[PDB]
Write a protein that binds this ligand. Structure first.
Ligand SMILES: Nc1ncnc2c1ncn2[C@@H]1O[C@H](COP(=O)(O)OP(=O)(O)OP(=O)(O)O)[C@@H](O)[C@H]1O
Ligand SMILES: Nc1ncnc2c1ncn2[C@@H]1O[C@H](COP(=O)(O)OP(=O)(O)OP(=O)(O)O)[C@@H](O)[C@H]1O
Ligand SMILES: Nc1ncnc2c1ncn2[C@@H]1O[C@H](COP(=O)(O)OP(=O)(O)OP(=O)(O)O)[C@@H](O)[C@H]1O
Ligand SMILES: [Mg+2]
Ligand SMILES: [Mg+2]
Ligand SMILES: [Mg+2]
Lengths: 477, 469, 53, 120, 484, 128, 120
């Protein structure tokens, strides 16, 4: 029984194995029915396996074979455009995966010295995010909010936006994407995949799925294996994005797994280890230095609150890890502000270095302006009236429609007009109309402006004055 | 010949070893396992009987196999100490992680030690002028004292510590030690960059800050013992080199949290809300070593995380007993846009007494707190009925209280990324004069917004002449 | 005229009072449910700790 | 309904009344098996216990099993773990009201509280 | 042999299971071969659960253990005055050995029903609010309860500092020796306490017992009982003494740790079932002995911390149930300038006016009614509605009285100085002054009486009761002075 | 009662009160070391009251003609119908006669709280 | 008291202070006796221990015992399981109230909550 064992007992997803003298901790084991498990507890005389599948598949007295490898997952370009479950089996129905290698599920996060401060943008194509709470490549940016508030919409629009660069040859500007479905309905993942295939985005993204019926260990394991999948891009000098949708359901699955091991419950019945779960998951997102090849892996972890309770245990623990949060409030999603970004609670601790200088210029101090608008709205005085008109029309200006990501070259003129005051000439209800006309105008009259903004990324006084004069030449009619 | 044994069990971060000989390792001794990726260090936690010893792993336990050999080092985890430690980054085990090569120290000392005796404690009062209005006014810090920044998730603790370092650490003549306990790695990298920019570190010359980091990605045992490693460096500077010392810790709650993580695996009955039984005494053993003594002066600033924003949680609750000055940061105040979000009433300090600061300063601070408490008391009435229902005296007090609340905000230079306001550093005497003037009603007229994010009363006047345009 | 304006102002004031009281009722209903769940869980943890003897 | 879908192709309605009592029975079964209770005393493996039921209710190449499920929420609390885990799966909600029935409206579906994922 | 000695089976977390020791008594003391001492708390059919008075790092499996033959006990005598000792009575101030009149067991039976006497004479604390509204009698137990940083230690320390007016005197029946028990505090706090007691030159008559946070859980547990034993020698020899426990909550925490690591079944909030027994057997040792038993008395002041103001918690509930009187410090009142922050509504002294000095009882009689009326009328007025002038009079006088009780820290007032102030408050002629300048009045009035009316102060002190002549004299003096 | 029900006669059974019986079952369960649940009740307390209360029936004219009415009594704490045992019994039963003490003080005796009281089935049986 | 009742034939007054302590004491031993703690930490046998004590006190046909017994109410909460279980055994309830005492009104009996069998 040095390289093999036999099962003593099975129950509630936990199996006890006699033998397996030479098994490593966290090693993978294969049961006689083909289902697989992780060697979690190495007690004297017995091993505690946790099952990556329905426990019906294992019965007492069956033999268990050692795999000889720590829990691992395939990695490489071949996963691109596929759908895989945890442990990386292809579930899309196409042929077997082609892999550049295999990597352990829980490789340690990179340390201090390898990293650089995050100085490149992830262009989401969403006006509110790109302007007020930007995301830098290698950042970890929480997306937090209540049920049905557009969280997946925000992450998915970010994924969809990259098509304008991913078609090029410039690997330094591309951004590959991994999306990790944990606890989601299988139909929801299928429909999301269909959406990605309709917008032609699938060819540069990977979907990792641990659907709602999957055994708890797979839901626990999915984010780690997906992080391993993204780390290959990180480590070979390419740029990756990883969305976790969502870490709350991973926390619930881990709670299940821990309690069935009868480890004592903690605050809110979560185990005391629950911080370490998300911490060692998320710290793997990083940008490496020029010595390491400048790679990065941008994380967008999703969290589902109850009643906007950002003070809950799991939300606070995640916020303690991520560099900032984008808070979506139901009270604004109802009454029609979408994507309903609450700018009061949203912050980006490494954001202001990521923005392209043009957008930072035109968006100057908007994060303070819209916090002052909050003070005005909470309670006419002509000054407060001026700021109130600006606030209402600016919030209208930030609204955006699903699956219509603006390029930054087109975002810049809009925020320019809104901030420098021309939109006082247009009644608010027509602002959306305004945009659809204005941009078309700029796309057919003096495209020079968009070309300069696209290539240079910063506005000289010549560009600044040109944009003033052209926006005046529009707003007059 | 070396004392050697074999691993018998592995569960999470806990490893049990069994020795054929009777020469068992002492508790808190370090043991080595030659895992191919680089030797793993175990720390003996308990003796289980039957010549079995239970230990905490300082690194990932993956790849361990039952029956792997283990060797006793013959002492506790021993870390380098000395003037050579300055300008370097060291791991919990004491190994360099800045890749600049071995630390050439003449001495190496254990991380576990007895606190200094009662005959050695020394008490003295001297305010550390931080340059931050709310601290310098309502909860002054003290040289040689112990300072705590309580706060929830994402409420400004780290920016606060960075501002304190930016102001004090360059002016202070003694050495400094920063001990990142469970902080995010990017924060440590940014700190290293900033300290190389501000000249506190120089690889081609002298340096006067030492760095110990065990980041939140580390397994729980390392996040436990890294704080004691930093304390060892600070103690060696305090006692043997005779220097004044600064000791920044972010975040010390993690030390308690790590304990709970291992506690269940150690075979203990859990305490309230799942904390380890030893929480009070383990925290005491860690925390009493940070003190000042007759040999030298240690000034320590300790960020304290608050789970679920609950200040009654056993860890913060038991941490309050160990501090001379505490400044609670509130999510509620931050959400109002007030930064640094220090709660002006929940903060407290031993130094705020008329004997120490003089009668004028104490009187001004007392009046400020009276006004803010009056404002807090009226919140239900103001919310439900609106401010028109207030008595004239109370309405005037409410206006003055709102102006005071916004006046206590301050733009730190470290926060320029977010405020868009170049940072301001405000002197103590100027702060007292500015608030004294406002309590006398001299600036009733200018609006509430004039006081927001401005340093000193005259800056308020200038911002009023800006808003009047 | 003053009497008519005063009674109209009383109607306005009490309407605003009812609105804000409703908002506070919402907030404290949410807080009450949250606290009830917390109380049940924490009272159960003691029993689980005892039973694990 | 699974047989009807997979072997005859009809679109089938699987009415369930009441799903909360499904969750409650799961909780009791968990407790009797000696499992440590989850938050507010519900079972562990609540999420996956619900999922094994709900995931089977879906469309295929042949047909679909649609499910109309009556939901009781304790203490009128929409945040309780059982209602939350149930709402996580629902595609639409139909809210009947006593007041609307008093107004003579029949079948008394509240047109504004009722909401659907597919009103798109 | 295994009768008088034992062999260590397993050791960790400060607990050592030992084999043998067949003859050892429950709660007995033992010495490990490595020199660390321990206390036996579990006897089981083949094991002894010994808890270590020190770091367990010096204990090793298979080590030998020797029975001491002594149940835990501590030195007692007059030599402990002016010293600092750890839980087991060893000196830690470093000022040399300690002279002892004898030794006493840590835990002892409280005095029974027969030997006791009525609570008969005052503990003058020097705080206007406490001495006027909620008096403490010699032999009483007074819980001081409130949240973090609310002045609890300040109140107890003022009570200690006030005794210098008599402890320097000749009459030992008037003295009061103070024992202070610091549990779970950082050493530097104790250092500042001793520095304060030396600055005021107070600790000629004080004993400090310290079990600081780093010291193992058994010592933090054991400290209050040993300090009680230290005070009981004063009690039994006819000398009045007062013990402050700062604070019993951390002792309860220490017992929770200790019992859990012995793996005894937990109770509510993981405290062991005995947690009520722990405080009850401690606190019943306070007593005023009858004339047959030497008339000495031991008074107790147990401090308690309530998290978030939750007076309903388990340990607060138990200690409230046990002690005779309760003093509640409210965080909110502290910021309003009402310092000390005594919540006079919740606070009660169940011994009552029998313990008060009779003069202060005479003048203070209606103060409590004034404040009770104020608590209703001010609450009504807070809603913004107006009311008849009678409610206005109650409000005004109550506001002046509440302002009158505020007091500077480390400045205790003798009853000869409290009496004029409370007289002016209740009788009137102190309700006309502006509220902001009452502090100016209170300071000056005494400074006036000490020169222009010295005889009245002398009589208020020495005869302790106010005749009609003295009440008329104080009426005249108050009317005369306030007119200025 | 079931004897009468089964032999064609009508009976009415009053359980006074089921909460105390639940407490007794809790005593038995805890001293048997059965796994606890919410408020330390065994999970089977819903099954216990359900197995009791479903025995009340009006049998069809074929199966005799009798019936067994039941009037279980429950003591709330501070009006908390949200409590566990009250929740279970409220779920199992066909309706609710609710009594409020505030009305009892007002001299409104026998203090039926008309608003919260409901009878789902009884309105079909009420005398014309 | 029983011996006076059943042999001496005299009427008896039996005063008890404080019977909460009888419940509370039973809790303290309960944990060490290896019992699982009940709700909020009381012993499982709370009700039957209370009964085995109380039901001995009664006016048999042989004599009369009149018992006045004090009950401590933790945190003034009348719903605490100890007072709540004690109420069932009482003919008259003299509920004293925090509020009435705070008004300066003694003996602070709540005129509404206090009740008696004989008010008829
Ligand atoms: N910008 C938008 N404009 C219009 N509709 C939108 C927008 N963003 C989201 N929606 C709609 O809002 C609804 C919820 O969106 P989405 O599925 O992204 O939410 P979610 O927070 O991820 O939900 P869940 O909690 O179910 O996972 C969908 O109808 C989506 O179409
Ligand atoms: N002076 C200031 N002005 C403006 N914003 C500030 C200021 N100080 C702090 N902040 C805001 O505080 C937010 C969080 O700061 P910080 O990273 O220090 O939080 P923290 O409480 O230490 O959080 P964590 O637990 O995640 O480490 C930053 O986004 C910054 O916007
Ligand atoms: N009457 C008073 N006037 C002014 N300041 C006071 C007064 N009483 C106490 N303080 C101050 O209040 C703060 C807390 O006082 P103290 O040390 O007595 O509190 P404590 O409740 O015992 O604290 P802890 O919980 O830290 O042990 C100290 O600054 C003390 O100087
Ligand atoms: Mg979604
Ligand atoms: Mg921080
Ligand atoms: Mg104190």
């Amino acid at each position: 029984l040095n390289e093999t064992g036999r099962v003593l007992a099975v129950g509630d997803g936990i199996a006890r194995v006699f033998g397996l003298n030479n098994i490593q901790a966290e090693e993978l084991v294969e049961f006689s029915s083909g289902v697989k498990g992780m060697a979690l507890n190495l007690e004297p005389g017995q091993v505690g396996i946790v099952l990556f599948g329905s426990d019906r598949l294992v019965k007492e007295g069956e033999l268990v074979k050692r795999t000889g490898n720590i829990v691992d997952v395939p990695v490489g370009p071949g996963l691109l455009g596929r759908v895989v479950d945890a442990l990386g089996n292809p579930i899309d129905g196409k042929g077997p995966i082609d892999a550049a290698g295999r990597s352990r599920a829980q490789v340690k996060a990179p340390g201090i010295l390898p990293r650089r401060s995050v100085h490149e943008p992830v262009q989401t194509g969403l006006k509110a995010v790109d302007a007020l709470v930007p995301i830098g490549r290698g950042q970890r940016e929480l997306i937090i909010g209540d049920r049905q508030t557009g969280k997946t919409a925000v992450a998915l629009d970010t994924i969809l936006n990259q098509k304008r660069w991913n078609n090029g040859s410039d690997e330094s500007k591309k951004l590959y994407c991994v999306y990790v479905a944990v606890g989601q309905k299988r139909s929801t993942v299928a429909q999301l995949v269909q959406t990605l295939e309709q917008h032609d985005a699938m060819k540069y993204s990977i979907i990792v799925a641990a659907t709602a019926s999957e055994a708890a260990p797979l839901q626990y394991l999915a984010p780690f294996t997906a992080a391993s999948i993204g780390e290959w891009f990180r480590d070979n000098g390419k740029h990756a994005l990883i969305v976790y949708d969502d870490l709350s359901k991973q926390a619930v699955a881990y709670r299940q797994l821990s309690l069935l091991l009868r480890r004592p419950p903690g605050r809110e019945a979560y185990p005391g280890d629950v911080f370490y779960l998300h911490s060692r998951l998320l710290e793997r997102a990083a940008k490496l230095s020029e010595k390491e090849g400048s790679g990065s892996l941008t994380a967008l972890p999703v969290i589902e609150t109850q009643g906007g309770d950002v003070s809950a245990y799991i939300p606070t623990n995640v916020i303690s890890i991520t560099d900032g949060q984008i808070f979506l409030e139901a009270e604004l999603f109802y009454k029609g502000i979408r994507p309903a970004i609450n700018v009061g609670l949203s912050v980006s601790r490494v954001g202001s270095a990521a923005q392209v200088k043009a957008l930072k210029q035109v968006a100057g101090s908007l994060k303070l302006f819209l916090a002052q608008y909050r003070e005005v709205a909470a309670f006419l005085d002509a000054s407060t009236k001026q700021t109130l008109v600006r606030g209402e029309r600016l919030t209208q200006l930030l609204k955006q429609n699903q699956y219509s990501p603006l390029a930054t070259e087109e975002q810049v003129p809009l925020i320019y007009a809104g901030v420098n005051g021309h939109l006082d000439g247009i009644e608010l209800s027509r602002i959306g109309e305004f945009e659809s006309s204005f941009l078309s105008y700029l796309k057919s009259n003096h495209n020079e402006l968009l070309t300069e903004i696209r290539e240079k990324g910063e506005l000289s006084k010549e560009l600044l004055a040109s944009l003033k004069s052209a926006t005046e030449s529009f707003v007059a009619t | 010949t070396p004392i050697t044994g074999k691993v018998t069990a592995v569960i999470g971060a806990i490893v049990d070893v069994h020795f054929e000989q009777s020469e068992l390792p002492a508790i808190l001794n370090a043991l080595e396992i030659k895992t191919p990726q680089g030797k793993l260090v175990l720390e003996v936690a308990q003796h289980l009987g039957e010549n079995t010893v239970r230990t905490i792993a300082m690194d990932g336990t993956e790849g361990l196999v039952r029956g792997e050999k283990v060797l006793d080092t013959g002492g506790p985890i021993s870390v380098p100490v000395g003037r050579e430690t300055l300008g370097r980054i060291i791991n919990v085990i004491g190994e360099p992680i800045d890749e600049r090569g071995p630390i050439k120290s003449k001495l190496r000392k254990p991380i576990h030690a007895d606190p200094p005796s009662f005959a050695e404690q020394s008490t003295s009062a001297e305010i550390l002028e931080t340059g931050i209005k709310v601290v310098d006014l309502l909860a002054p810090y003290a040289r040689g004292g112990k300072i705590g920044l309580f706060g929830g998730a994402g409420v400004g603790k780290t920016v606060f510590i960075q501002e304190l370092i930016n102001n004090i650490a360059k002016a202070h003549g003694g050495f400094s030690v920063f001990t990142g306990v469970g902080e995010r790695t990017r924060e440590g990298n940014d700190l290293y960059r900033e300290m190389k920019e501000t000249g506190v570190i120089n690889l081609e010359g002298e340096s006067k800050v030492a760095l110990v980091f065990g980041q939140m990605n580390e397994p729980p045992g390392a996040r436990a013992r890294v704080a004691l490693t930093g304390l060892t460096i600070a103690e060696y500077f305090r006692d043997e080199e005779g220097q004044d010392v600064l000791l920044f810790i972010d975040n010390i709650f993690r030390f308690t949290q790590a304990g709970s993580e291992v506690s269940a695996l150690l075979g203990r009955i859990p305490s309230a809300v799942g904390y380890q039984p030893t929480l009070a005494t383990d925290m005491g053993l860690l925390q009493e070593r940070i003190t000042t003594t007759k040999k030298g002066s240690v000034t320590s600033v300790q960020a304290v995380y608050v789970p679920a924003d609950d200040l009654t949680d056993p860890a913060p609750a038991t941490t309050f007993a160990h501090l001379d000055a505490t400044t609670v940061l509130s999510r509620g105040i931050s959400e109002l846009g007030i930064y640094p979000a220090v709660d002006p009433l929940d903060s407290k300090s031993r130094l705020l007494d008329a004997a120490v600061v003089g009668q004028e300063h104490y009187d001004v601070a007392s009046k400020v707190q009276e006004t803010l408490q009056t404002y807090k008391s009226l919140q239900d009435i103001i919310a439900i009925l609106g401010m028109d229902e207030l008595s004239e005296q109370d309405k005037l007090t409410v206006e003055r209280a709102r102006k005071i609340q916004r006046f206590l905000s301050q733009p730190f230079a470290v926060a320029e990324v977010f405020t868009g306001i170049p940072g301001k550093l405000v002197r103590l005497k100027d702060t007292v004069a500015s608030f004294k003037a406002v309590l006398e009603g001299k600036y009733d007229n200018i609006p509430e917004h004039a006081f927001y994010m401005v340093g000193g009363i005259e800056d308020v006047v200038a911002k009023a002449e800006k808003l009047a345009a | 005229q003053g009497y008519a304006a005063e009674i109209s102002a009383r109607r306005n004031a009490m309407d605003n009072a009812s609105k804000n009281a409703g908002d506070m009722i919402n907030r404290y209903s949410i807080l009450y449910n949250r606290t009830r769940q917390a109380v049940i869980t924490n009272e159960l943890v003691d029993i689980i700790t005892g039973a694990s003897s």
